[PDB]
Structure formats: structure tokens, C-alpha cells
Design an enzyme around this catalytic site. Structure first.
Site, PDB file in Angstrom:
ATOM      1  N   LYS A 128       8.583  97.201 -58.133  1.00 27.35           N
ATOM      2  CA  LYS A 128       8.680  95.746 -58.154  1.00 27.35           C
ATOM      3  C   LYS A 128       8.131  95.178 -59.457  1.00 27.35           C
ATOM      4  CE  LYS A 128       8.063  95.205 -53.174  1.00 27.35           C
ATOM      5  NZ  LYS A 128       9.179  94.700 -52.332  1.00 27.35           N
TER       6      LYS A 128
ATOM      7  N   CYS B  48      -2.098  75.771 -66.801  1.00 24.19           N
ATOM      8  CA  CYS B  48      -0.832  75.847 -67.571  1.00 24.19           C
ATOM      9  C   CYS B  48      -0.251  74.509 -68.051  1.00 24.19           C
ATOM     10  CB  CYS B  48       0.276  76.445 -66.695  1.00 24.19           C
ATOM     11  SG  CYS B  48       0.241  78.299 -66.639  1.00 24.19           S
TER      12      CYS B  48
END
EC number: 2.3.1.74
Lengths: 388, 388
Positions: free
Chosen positions: B54, B163
Site C-alpha cells: 500500500k 499546512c
């Protein structure tokens, strides 16, 4: 498109003005007279007799009658790691303060918004300030949700700045209000000692001093330029600000946020450093205004402890009444970090109005607000009172 | 004393302008192609085969070629608790980032001050922004000392915002420069992934995505109103800002600072939320300017990951070249949190100038900068380019 035309239409015209002030504190009221016994019992340090005697002298000299604390005996009983001098406990502390900071801030903010009297939808900017924990989204997001502010409120989240930040939020709000037409800034300082509470240790008496002085509380302001006459009610006007780092003060007030919580370290003489640098700060602020008599202005000083106040008063030959408002908040609430200076503004304007003085600044025109904290940093805010 | 006269003499006249941009990154360059192998080896998770598969797909879809990391193999070997998914490690992480954040910020700041070309003694305000650790005095004090700024620089320490903060520092700098005559603001965003690095866990794939995308870097700006023609060199002008919380986004991006460091939790579809709310943000910003063609403006978007960019482009029918500058920084540096948008401004103006375009905004007049982060918060900054 004309940027000059946009800029002219976008900005405000007059001085940033404080239009409302509201405060709040945890319900739990802790007497100072009995604190030595309580604190040594709850931290399991009753055998440390000489240390307890030192703490008793600290509390007796503190000039604090009582403090309001989120931490209770019951909470401290469930958290032995918080009661130790140094044990892993940040997760527990963060869980307390990530909820308590916005809870307590909301109480103050609601009081300020009620005083202001205008729709909370007219709040365009939000400044939230705390040294009690951090999280993402921050306490600014939480208070936007709790109060139902517009989702587009412009937020300023001031974390981990310390005891001098009540000046910092004023310095910031001044530029937000003054450069934006119609802006109305909600300012919330909310400080909770669950992040710094810890047991005593005889080789770290600097940490112990904080246990004698720090208390909890929140204060909120509405700040805006161009108040609407008779609808909005000016309290104080901000005219000029400064922030500076005192010489020869490296490591005077350090604070590190670690797995055992926030711990403070005092490596130099804070009252000495503040007292030695306060004149320089006053002449920077007031020489341009033509004023040199520091008894002729009204005073607000962060009461980091009583000897800061005593040494400033002695240095300048302040009359004893100058620090009355400051000392009244120290006595009834202790050192509440960033919120403390805002409680002092509230006390000063309330006592001035109750007693029929001519201005909100004790009947005087010009005043000064100081914050003192890590760096060593001095924040200066020059204020003008309002008639009646 | 006349406050009206003081206020008139104190404020600036024109739009806040970016006058210099400088960036820096840790020396250690980590290839993305070989990262899955490195990261699973260093965190002792080679047996977790399905999880590693993954992560390999995450890195392959990331559209990142390389990142710069303070953390090295040697540092990670000395810190097994940082390599675990969840182990007590904040003290170790804080020790790294309390030094690295100002170190790296200093490199960027020196570059910006050199470009600007004026004495560092003319810097009146300092904004420092990081989501990597906290300390008292903060990274703002450290950078004041490291750079030798005046002790009276007015500081704004923005911790733990995430962010979306590259927009927040721009929004703040605009008001500081515009309301203060002669003010020159140094802005430093410095982000280091040592606070979030951690081992993999198959029940927390949201945390794993961050391990594929986040990288380190710092960017610094000089922002001021009323540039001195031909001595100072405007790059971009700021005209209008906004910050908003998207509806139906509660818990989209949470981040908690705990004894095991900072961990991020993604509970909703971030690319979907940003894409669904980006039009509303654009019409708030550009309807007042008369512009509705979003291919006619230059673009800077925080590349939180590639599907934010892909879904925004598809939603608006942006031409593929609109996100070139953004995608180039994502490719060469990864997601550097608050600094990323400032690297994108640098890339855009450099490529525009190198290639002989007419303005620093790709030959266009008006542009938009977006930050995206916890809340879900969208920061919008409307910019105007400068000729040549």
C-alpha cells in the site's frame, strides 16, 4: 482595476479602540493562606519540611489572596503523574486544557459580546492566545464553533508565547482593526495552569515560585476602529506599540513543553531586569508625546510577581496608588499570564466609572500597558483613556 | 496631542509588496523511488507485506520525485522510539526541531535579506511560522539572535497552525506592512518532519499517507509597503485576503501534539472538500475585481497531495499548465507545510523572469494563492504581479 482605489476603500480611518471587556475564571477558588498545606499534601511532599517552609514564605510574600484553578483535589487524585515533580503527563494535561481553554474563553467572550451589544456576525477577526496546550485545529477553531462566529472569521492563533502576550494581542489587534474598514476583532486570552502544575523539588525553587503565583482565567475584548457614536462605546484607544528584548537577559524566563508538561526555568533576576529597562521603554513611548512625568499617566503592568511591581515603583518613584489596579488583580486572581493585563484594564475602567472619575484611565489622559515574559521580552502599549 | 495626526503620520500608503524570497532545505535528499524500502527497513516493518505494498502505491501516485529530510538513517538509528508507530518520543523530537527550525529558517532568511539588499537593521517586524515543535522563548527569539536583528523587532510567533499557514503569514504581513509607515517585515516559514515521522500501522493509513508526502524546508520573505523605486524590487503585491472553514469538514485534518509526537488524522475526503469549496472562494475574491475566467489568473495552491490539485483542475477546467509551478515544487520538494506556497511563488517568479515573460505572474496580471489545512481551513490571498 485600481489597487490604490481598492486600498483606500479597504482601510479604516481612526485609532483601534477597545469597545468591550469581559472576563471569566474556573469556579474552584483556592485560598492562598491555606495553599502550602494543600499543595504539599496533594503532591505527597509533607516530609520535605525545609522546602515546605520556603514555599510558605513564597506564598506569604506573594501578595495574592486567592486564585481560581481548573485543577481540583479530585482531578489531582486521578492524576498522580501531574502531582509529581517530573513524570510523563503531557497527554493528560493536554486532554484537560484543549477543552478548558476554549470553554473558559467562551465564557469571557460571551460577556464581552453582550457588553458590545452588536451581532456576533459583525466579528470579522479573532485572536486567541494561550500558553496552555496546543492542538490542530486550534483553540481559535474551537471558539469559532462554540460561539457560532461566521466561518469566514479571520483567525490568529497565538500559542505558547507566555506572560507577555496580553501586550502582543493588543499590538496585533491594533493593526487588524486599523487597516481594515469595519473590522471588529474579538480577542480572547485564556490561560489554565494544568499544563504547569507539578510537585515540589528542593533543587528547582524557580519552578516552585510559579506554583505560588500562577492562576487561571480568561479575558476577551472587542477591538475596532471608527466606533459608531452612541451605539458603540469606546473604553480605551491604542496609539503606539513596541516589543523589545532586554539586554543581558538571556535565559531569564525559559519554558519547555515536554513529555512531563510545561516547566519554567528562572535563571536571572526578573524584577531587576524589568526595573532596569523600564525607563528606556517609557522614554521610547512617551518622549514623542512630550511626557516625562510617569505619575501623570495611568498604569497597567503585568504582575509577574510582586517584586517586579515593587522594583518598578521604587525605580521611577511612582506614587503607591499608580499600581492599585494591577495589585488588586494580583491579589484577587494571581498571575494569569496573558489574560492578566486585560483583567487590569477591566478593573481600572470599572473602578474609574463606579467612582465618578473623568476618564476610564483614573481621570488621566494617557496611559501605558506592559507585558513581561520570556526573552526577556517587554511589550509596551500606549493608551488614551475615554471621557466618562 | 492629536491622535488623528499621529495615526496619519504612522501608517503606510500603498499595498503590501513581496520584495525578496529565499528558500533553504536540509542537505539530506531522499529519493521517492526507493523510499518504501528505506522507510520499512528503518522502522522494522519489512514483514508487513500488504502494508508495504500500500505504501509503495502511495509513493508511486504521490508525484513527488524527492524530499529533503533533517532525519537521516543515523539519527533514526539513535531514536527507535521515533521509528515506532506510537512510542514516547516528544522530548527527542523537540530537541531536534527546536534547533533545526531556526537553523533552517536562518538559511532562508539570509538569502532573502541578500536579495532585498537593505540593512537587516531596517527589519521592523518578524513573523516566524512552524508546526514543528514549540518552545519559550520561541523560534522568533532564536532567529532574532541568530540573524542579529534589532532587539526591538516586533515579533509574531505562529506555532502549530499546519499546512494552511503559508497563506496565514501573508495575511498577517499585509496588515503589518500596510498600517505602519516604513515597516519591513521578515517572514520565515520553517517546517521539519521530525515531529511527525513515525512507523507504519495498517489500521492508520491516514498517518501513513503523510509519510509519503511530507518533506522539510524553509522559505523567507521581505514584505513592505511603499517600496523605494529602483532600490527595492517588487515581486508580487497583495490586494485582498480571506480565511474560511469549509462546511461539512469537521475532522477532515486533525493533528494532536502528544507524548509520542505529532500525529495527523484524516477523517474525510480532503480533495473532495477543497474542490467543492474552491469556486466559492474564487468568487469571493474575484467577483469584486470583475474576473470570472480562472484561467486568466496565475495560480499557487498548497499541494497537500496531488489529488487536491487534480480535483481542483477538473472542477474548474483549468488548463494543465496552470498548476505547473505548484506541481514542480511538489515534485522536487514534496509537501513542506506552510513553506510550500512560498517556494511556489519563488518558482513562479524565477521561471517567469528566466523565460522573458512580461510579469512575475506568468505574464498575467492577477493571481491567487491558496493554503489548505486543519479546520478544514482555506486561506485565500489575491495577488497582482509586477512588470518584468
Amino acid at each position: 482595476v485600481s489597487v490604490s482605489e481598492i486600498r483606500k476603500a479597504q482601510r479604516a480611518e481612526g485609532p483601534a479602540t477597545i469597545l468591550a471587556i469581559g472576563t471569566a475564571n474556573p469556579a474552584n477558588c483556592v485560598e492562598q493562606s491555606t495553599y502550602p498545606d494543600f499543595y504539599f499534601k496533594i503532591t505527597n511532599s509533607e516530609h520535605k519540611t525545609e522546602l515546605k517552609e520556603k514555599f510558605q514564605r513564597m506564598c506569604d510574600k506573594s501578595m495574592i489572596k486567592r486564585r481560581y484553578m481548573y485543577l481540583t483535589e479530585e482531578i489531582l487524585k486521578e492524576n498522580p503523574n501531574v502531582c509529581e515533580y517530573m513524570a510523563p503527563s503531557l497527554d493528560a494535561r493536554q486532554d484537560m486544557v484543549v477543552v478548558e481553554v476554549p470553554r473558559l474563553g467562551k465564557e469571557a467572550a460571551v460577556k464581552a459580546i453582550k457588553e458590545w451589544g452588536q451581532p456576533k456576525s459583525k466579528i470579522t477577526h479573532l485572536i486567541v492566545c494561550t500558553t496552555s496546550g496546543v492542538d490542530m485545529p486550534g483553540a481559535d477553531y474551537q471558539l469559532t464553533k462554540l460561539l457560532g462566529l461566521r466561518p469566514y472569521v479571520k483567525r490568529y492563533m497565538m500559542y505558547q508565547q507566555g506572560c507577555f502576550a496580553g501586550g502582543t494581542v493588543l499590538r496585533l489587534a491594533k493593526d487588524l482593526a486599523e487597516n481594515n474598514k469595519g473590522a471588529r476583532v474579538l480577542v480572547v486570552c485564556s490561560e489554565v495552569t494544568a499544563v504547569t502544575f507539578r510537585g515540589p523539588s528542593d533543587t528547582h525553587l524557580d519552578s516552585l515560585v510559579g506554583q505560588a503565583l500562577s492562576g487561571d482565567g480568561a479575558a476577551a475584548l472587542i477591538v475596532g476602529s471608527d466606533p459608531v457614536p452612541e451605539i458603540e462605546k469606546p473604553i480605551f484607544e491604542m496609539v503606539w506599540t513596541a516589543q523589545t528584548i532586554a539586554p543581558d537577559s538571556e535565559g531569564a524566563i525559559d519554558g519547555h513543553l515536554r513529555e512531563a508538561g510545561l516547566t519554567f526555568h528562572l535563571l536571572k533576576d526578573v524584577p531587576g531586569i524589568v526595573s532596569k529597562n523600564i525607563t528606556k521603554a517609557l522614554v521610547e513611548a512617551f518622549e514623542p508625546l512630550g511626557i516625562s512625568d510617569y505619575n501623570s499617566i495611568f498604569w497597567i503592568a503585568h504582575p509577574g510577581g510582586p517584586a517586579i511591581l515593587d522594583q518598578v515603583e521604587q525605580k521611577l518613584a511612582l506614587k503607591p496608588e499608580k499600581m492599585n489596579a494591577t495589585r488588586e488583580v494580583l491579589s484577587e486572581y494571581g498571575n494569569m499570564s496573558s489574560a492578566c493585563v486585560l483583567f487590569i484594564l477591566d478593573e481600572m475602567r470599572k473602578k474609574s466609572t463606579q467612582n465618578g472619575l473623568k476618564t476610564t484611565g483614573e481621570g488621566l489622559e494617557w496611559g501605558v500597558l506592559f507585558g513581561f515574559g520570556p526573552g526577556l521580552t517587554i511589550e509596551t502599549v500606549v493608551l488614551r483613556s475615554v471621557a466618562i
